[PDB]
Amino acid sequence: IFKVGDTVVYPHHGAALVEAIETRTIKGEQKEYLVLKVAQGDLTVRVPAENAEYVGVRDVVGQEGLDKVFQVLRAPHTEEPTNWSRRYKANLEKLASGDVNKVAEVVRDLWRRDQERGLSAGEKRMLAKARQILVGELALADAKAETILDEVLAAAALEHHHHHH
Amino acid sequence: IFKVGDTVVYPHHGAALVEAIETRTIKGEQKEYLVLKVAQGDLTVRVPAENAEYVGVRDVVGQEGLDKVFQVLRAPHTEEPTNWSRRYKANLEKLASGDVNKVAEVVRDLWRRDQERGLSAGEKRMLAKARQILVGELALADAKAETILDEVLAAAALEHHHHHH
């Protein structure tokens, strides 16, 4: 489909924080607006509450926790053990860690391996499990929200982000 | 749903440009990757071509044209004629202009009026028409792509973006 010079709409997914809610009466009804901190404070976006179709993320994670997860999934230079066993054992340790950032590394590495060379049976089952742990650490206590979240995270996992300002 | 302190995933939609396509052979198959210029050159994202589910945008518009349209739709300080007739006549002129930026102003103003106070019958029909012109100026020569594009533009229209770096 794509060729050099093509312009597309890219969804730069990221963490946003509700810093304020504005209530207005427009005659003669109540209207609520979210004031969002997005891009780590570089941008304020104000959006109607009823037109805010965004997946929520747990408070223990927060804006910084969520942006960190995105950074991990989008990390371009990864170091993966070449040998299956060393790699499997390391990811096993990561899934048992309780650190969402390490779970993200597993999800990232395995999604990329899947599209690149394909997964072994155990690796495929590991990916199914890691994705579910990651979503579980992030999503609000909903199955539709978890599906959307899983898609967003999977797409991020495939992306290498290079920052140059 | 939402309250202050809540963290969400915000899709910061924007223009991306395919600057390069990388071809790789991973034994022993061909794999294509897009090298995207996103955030006006602040970020490079590299994504597998087969996993790039992005709406394309016409070349006459381009990356700068597309980002401009987003800026217009997200403009927070708008000046709209209070009187219905003055407002209607101005938007009529804009829809006949051939300038996609002016069409964007109509789409923006009417989406916001709709959620705020509601539209008159003529204004509602104007919005239906403006959205279709805007999509037509942007989309590739597909009805699924136009639907997604229309949703993206509508969501942008409702958003006030404040830049503070």
Curated annotation (Swiss-Prot), chains A, B:
GO biological process assignments: rRNA transcription
Pfam families: CarD_C, CarD_TRCF_RID
Xref: Gene3D superfamilies: 2.40.10.170, CarD-like, C-terminal domain
Keywords: Virulence
Function recorded in the entry: Controls rRNA transcription by binding to the RNA polymerase (RNAP). Required for replication and persistence during infection of mice.
Family from the record: Belongs to the CarD family.
Full protein name: RNA polymerase-binding transcription factor CarD
